[model samples]
Target: MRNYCTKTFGSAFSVTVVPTLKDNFSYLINDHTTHTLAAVDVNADYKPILTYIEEHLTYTFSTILSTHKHWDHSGGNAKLKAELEAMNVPVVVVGGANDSIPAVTKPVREGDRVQVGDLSVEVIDAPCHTRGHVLYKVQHPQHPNDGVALFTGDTMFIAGIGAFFEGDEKDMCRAMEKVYHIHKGNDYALDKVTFIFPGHEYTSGFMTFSEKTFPDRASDDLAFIQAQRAKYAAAVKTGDPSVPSSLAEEKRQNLFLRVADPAFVAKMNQGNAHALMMYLYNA
Candidate 1:
């Protein structure tokens, strides 16, 4: 059996992190009030998702939100749509129109909102990991002022950023800026306290690299990061899931997010994409 984690919050919103295919992560967002479910990404093997819904019985998928057009993200779109159709439940797949997300029935852009049950998620264009990548921000309906939860596909991470695969450093810089813009205004705003659900469990690795990258800086912040990494590593050893990190914490710990700083940029690029490509490149 595969290991995963489930957390419930708000009135009826529960998010289940379904671990799929090695290190991949797919989230099941369920609203018990409407008995409706939605998925963030679907792996090629649909058994994990299908089994969960079947066991739940009352919950049925109403929609799917694709962060990008990556095959790992959209592999089971057609299969999911077909299976749900036979159960008399038509599922709508939503994503950026230009990304060619598989089985995308409702193509959305930045500022568009996709609703599942009573919860609606706002789409923010984040094109760096992929040319048409997007991020989803979901706020609680009853407590709109409360911190939102972000599904950051591959654009941002707990302590790092995604690789510049289809885009360049300039592209990534702009994408990072967009993310900052969304969470601006109040430093302690709801968006700042936002929980980030990344596409992969890369926190441990990122923490390791951060230590190596800043060997000379033995600050208290670095010590705190090391402690967090140790905790995550212990969890992984026991098959425990890594929970989401807040945007505030990310700003403090994420090294790659400081790309705009000339000194940092010089350290990273080192007269080419060599250092950066070595550190952040996904492939």
Candidate 2:
């Protein structure tokens, strides 16, 4: 099931999804504008990523944008870097400053910008699943039609957010706030066209959880997700990656994102999002 597929953003840029391990996803971001190539979240099974690069990219690989220190996401960083080095391909490994990311040569924080060809990759602070966890945002701001691609390692998943392994309810909810409002100029970040590419393929389990636990809340969204699942089942080659889901759409479907809804808070008998988050996840 290591079938890789590329998703193009206009004529100048695209992202190639490289399925690794059982459900983890790694990606290669290509900027055709300047013939630049970069990768994101390479895991233990990095041979596929290397193979994909060998087959598709004519340009040299430049960077690795790691989202966190988790084994599934950063396990292959050192190996990949070494292999690329062996080929004489100079690769700069970038990751968050708060955690010990494997083979990280460059540590970045929020508000930083990484340039790939003409494409700008914005570093966003997303410390929930891990203290140093971050999301990489890519878009041609001048070309709004191309839309935004968010590589949310484990912070934001398809229909649910990731488990809080390194942070608490307060930290996670605060991180959620940052994600929703990252596009500060807009009233809500939804004003801009955005797509989410999460770290794992866990849509089926998350959708089922919402349907059973919050039966009355996300009917339309659930139906839409189900339809997409069916369509992708017929269309996709690997992982059935439920990708390109918009930030606007995620707000409607992801239960954690709905924690702030008055109706949701009332039904759960939780006063606020933070309280509900604690009650829902605390073991």
**Candidate with the greatest TM-score versus the true structure:** 2
Top lDDT model: 2
Tell me the number of clashing residue pairs for each predicted model: 0, 0
Candidate 1 residue 19 Cα shift, in angstroms, is 0.3
lDDT of 1 by residue, 177-199 (tens): 66655756655476555777888
Off by over 4 Å in 2: 187-192, 215-219, 225-239, 260-269
TM-score of each: 0.86, 0.88
**lDDT value, residue 242 of candidate 1:** 68
The residue-by-residue lDDT of candidate 2 on 1-283, one tens digit each, is 5478777887868888888899888998988887888889988898888888777665768888899999999999889888888876568999999977999988989999888778889998878799999999897766656777889988878767788888888877777677666655666644346778889877766765655555454457667656655654554445456665677877766677677455776877756788887875652
Q: What is the C-alpha RMSD of each candidate to the true structure, in Å?
A: 3.3, 2.7
What is the RMSD, in Å, between candidate 2 and the native fold over all Cα?
2.7
Worst 10 contiguous positions by lDDT, candidate 2: 231-240
Distance from true position, residue 208, model 1, in Å?
A: 0.6
